[PDB]
């Protein structure tokens, strides 16, 4: 990571979501709810976020096994809307299951390697943020946004400062999002910008938190 090669790390893990309830004659209904992708570039911090409206769904089954391709779809048609000089020269994922799909998926696109991994990115965690939890539940067609999960800290940090960072975060919130959001919160004042994703804090206050988050996922 970090050279002059770009890198995607893609999460699927959140493509396809349901809300399971119980009815009163005692059965399990299972319904989809929008769900998204997560394409992240971990040396700038750009994150193409690709929702995943439940009318993709239409008329089909075992849709668990089906987000897979779904994902590698997408993936393959963001790369294909891109100029030569943006495409990854590598994508990395966590699911195993991806793998295949994406090999099948970029067969026209011979310079890109695709490796999976074991690490712990927990995506997953900012559907807890409410700047993508809405933006997800509230879609009524798919859609890409554009974001950057660095915010101003590569003014200051270095790109593997900045992924270690967010990191932690993403994992904090996951075991913990009650007691992170209160770490990520030092003081009363504390606040995050409009268009930013985390918190504006000091280099002492992001030294502390930092520690308290390793803490907190350490404890789990
Ligand atoms: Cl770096
Ligand atoms: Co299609
Ligand atoms: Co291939
Ligand atoms: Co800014």
């Not at 911090?45 to 089909?60: C, D, E, P, R, Y």
């Not at 891109?82 to 793998?99: F, S």
């Not at 209160?182 to 910008?193: A, C, F, G, Q």
Request: glycine share 4%; hydrophobic share 45%.
């Amino acid at each position: 990571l970090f050279s002059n090669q770009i890198i995607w790390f893609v999460d699927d893990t959140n493509v396809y979501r349901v809300t399971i309830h119980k009815t009163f004659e005692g059965n399990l209904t299972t319904k989809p709810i929008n769900g998204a992708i997560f394409i992240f570039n971990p040396r700038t911090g750009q994150l193409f976020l690709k929702i995943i409206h439940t009318s993709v769904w239409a008329g089909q089954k075992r849709l668990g096994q089906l987000a897979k391709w779904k994902t590698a779809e997408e993936v393959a048609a963001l790369i294909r809307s891109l100029p030569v000089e943006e495409q990854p020269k590598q994508i990395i994922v966590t699911a195993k299951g991806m793998l295949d799909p994406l090999e099948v998926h970029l067969l026209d696109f011979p310079n890109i390697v695709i490796k999976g991994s074991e690490l712990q990115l927990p995506f997953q965690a900012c559907l807890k943020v409410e700047k993508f939890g809405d933006l997800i539940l509230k879609a009524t067609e798919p859609q890409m946004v554009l974001f950057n999960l660095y915010d101003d800290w590569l003014k200051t940090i270095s790109s593997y400062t900045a992924f270690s960072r967010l990191i932690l975060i993403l994992r904090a919130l996951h075991v913990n999002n009650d007691r992170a959001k209160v770490i990520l919160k030092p003081d009363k004042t504390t606040i995050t910008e409009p268009h930013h994703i985390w918190p504006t804090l000091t280099d002492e206050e992001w030294i502390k938190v930092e520690v308290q988050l390793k803490d907190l996922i350490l404890a789990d």
